[PDB]
Amino acid sequence: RASRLDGQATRLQILEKAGELFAEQGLANTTSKQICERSQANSAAVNYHFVNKEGLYRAVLLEAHARLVQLETLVSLNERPGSPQDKLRALITVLVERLHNHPDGWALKVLTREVLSPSVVLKEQSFPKAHILRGLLGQIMNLPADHPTTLRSAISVFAPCLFLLIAHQPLQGLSLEPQGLIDHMMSYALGGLQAVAATAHD
Amino acid sequence: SRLDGQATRLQILEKAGELFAEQGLANTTSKQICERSQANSAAVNYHFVNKEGLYRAVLLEAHARLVQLETLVSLNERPGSPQDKLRALITVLVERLHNHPDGWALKVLTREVLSPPKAHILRGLLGQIMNLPADHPTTLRSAISVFAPCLFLLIAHQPLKQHVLQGLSLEPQGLIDHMMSYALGGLQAVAATAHDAAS
């Protein structure tokens, strides 16, 4: 709807649309005009709440952090009983659902893009330590959650999803459809995990 | 007469390459570039005009060096099996993860293609490993499964090595053996579903 310039509805609307824009196009490529256009807000509203494009981006990074931790909290707590495989499938499903047309997508794309490249610079305290993934991977391979094979497997499993979140137009035109992507990732992951667990147990 | 300056041009480019590889474009300063190259702002500006000109020259030289390296590796490994070839590719990448004079070209180009016919080479390799055509959907997805871990290690292993995958062993031979074993296990599994779908 129409909201007072100084209110929190206007601040949130600007924050979220600039989140989407920044997740698409990075900081440097995005303009004041593009932010105002997508947010449907005057430059006065933007400046009132965020001072400038850099202040807005820093707000976006803070909110993205909060939303990543909310999703980490929601995953740890909504853990349905099941096989380690079915849990890994549910975790991968959460990620794949956030790749296209998801309200939380922009938080993940902004943060993963910032974790690859820096710029308060993103070099502070701790983040989510992928506790639930490493736990699942260790159970699937029967190795401790901080066994070296488990740490490497974490990269082998999440890196493709991270890659898909931030790819722009590198993608020979294969379909976005989540089921075929989830089934590939599960079959591939269980094949690779089984192989490296065998080596680690030899 | 312009030749006397080319050596200075290359040194500044290579030192700027290393900076850009470790810190990205946004965080690198003309001060740091001048300090690492041991050249004044006048000499940098003479060759490259500004920091943006330098970065573009860095991207072109990096591209040339990547193609030299893919040409050399492809040549050395031609007689091998598809698996041997995939292992050689993974080996050159893991060798370039830190403190390698080729490293900066790979990291700089990787950073740039993540955030603005190279993929068909890996797809051909993965297709032969799986006995699937190079543009089968399983081959297209498998290419992401095989390269994305490499790319992620290349340009942000320290951020995850010491913050959020704390204790990660980046020991190169263990890392190559992992990715080879993991890739061959995953490729075998998805190849099997794809050959079943056609049977």
Helix (H/G/I), strand (E/B), else coil: A144: coil
**Contact between residue B187 and residue B129 where contact means Cβ atoms under 8 Å apart:** yes
Angle between helices A53-77 and A32-39 (to 10 degrees): 50
Dihedral angle over CA of B140, B142, B146, B147, nearest 10: 20
Question: Does the beta-carbon distance from B187 to A188 stay under 8 Å?
Answer: yes
B15 secondary structure, DSSP code: H
- For chain B, say whether A144 makes contact (Cβ under 8 Å): no
CA distances from B169 to A110, A116, B158, B175 (A): 27, 19, 11, 8
State residue B96 phi and psi, 5-degree precision.
-100, 10
Domain assignment present for residue A3? The answer is no
Cα–Cα–Cα angle for B45, B49, B52, nearest 5°? Answer: 115
B97 secondary structure, DSSP code: S
Of B15, B172, B63, B186, residue with least CA distance to A153: B186
- For chain A, say whether B193 makes contact (Cβ under 8 Å): yes
- For chain B, say whether A202 makes contact (Cβ under 8 Å): no
Instruction: Tell me the CATH number at A168.
Output: 1.10.357.10
Helix (H/G/I), strand (E/B), else coil: A120: coil
- For chain A, say whether B189 makes contact (Cβ under 8 Å): yes
Number of separate domains in chain B: 1
Partner residue facing A162 (CB), from B152, B163, B182:
B152
Q: Which domain holds residue B75?
A: 2-199
Domain assignment present for residue A2? The answer is no
Partner residue facing A155 (CB), from B26, B149, B185:
B149
Three-class SS string for B99-131? Answer: CCCCHHHHHHHHHHHHCCCCHHHHHHHHHHHHC
Helix (H/G/I), strand (E/B), else coil: A128: coil
Q: Tell me the C-alpha distance between B29 and B10, whole Å.
A: 18
**Residue-wise over B88-98: b if at least 16 C-beta within 10 A, else e?**
ebbbbbbebbe
Dihedral angle over CA of B89, B95, B100, B102, nearest 10: 0
**Contact between residue A178 and residue A102 where contact means Cβ atoms under 8 Å apart:** no
Question: Does the beta-carbon distance from B140 to A172 stay under 8 Å?
Answer: yes
- For chain B, say whether A51 makes contact (Cβ under 8 Å): no
Q: Enter the tokens of residue B174.
A: 């263990």
**Contact between residue B164 and residue A126 where contact means Cβ atoms under 8 Å apart:** yes
Burial of B17 (0-12, 13-18, 19+ CB in 10 A): buried
Query: Residue type at A70?
Result: Q
B173 Cα to chain A: minimum distance (Å): 13
Of A10, A201, A21, residue with least CA distance to A110: A21
Query: Residue type at B10?
Result: L
Q: Tell me the C-alpha distance between B25 and B109, whole Å.
A: 12
**Contact between residue B151 and residue B109 where contact means Cβ atoms under 8 Å apart:** no
In chain A, the residue whose alpha carbon lies closest to the alpha carbon of B182 is A192
- For chain B, say whether A147 makes contact (Cβ under 8 Å): no
Q: Write down the H helix ranges in chain B.
A: 3-27, 30-37, 41-48, 51-77, 82-95, 103-114, 119-130, 137-155, 158-161, 172-198
Q: Tell me the C-alpha distance between A15 and A35, whole Å.
A: 9
- For chain A, say whether B169 makes contact (Cβ under 8 Å): yes
Q: Tell me the C-alpha distance between A119 and A54, whole Å.
A: 10
Q: What is the resolution of this structure in A?
A: 2.4
Q: Tell me the C-alpha distance between A107 and A157, whole Å.
A: 20
Let me know how long chain B is.
199
Q: Tell me the C-alpha distance between B63 and B110, whole Å.
A: 10
Q: Tell me the C-alpha distance between A93 and A72, whole Å.
A: 14
Burial of A121 (0-12, 13-18, 19+ CB in 10 A): exposed
A88 Cα to chain B: minimum distance (Å): 15
Q: How was this structure determined?
A: X-ray
DSSP sequence for A6-69: TSHHHHHHHHHHHHHHHHHHHHHH--HHHHHHHHT--HHHHHHHHSSHHHHHHHHHHHHHHHHH
- For chain B, say whether A156 makes contact (Cβ under 8 Å): yes
Domain assignment present for residue A70? The answer is yes
> Position of tokens 């549910």?
A90
B46 Cα to chain A: minimum distance (Å): 26
> Position of tokens 């989407």?
A20
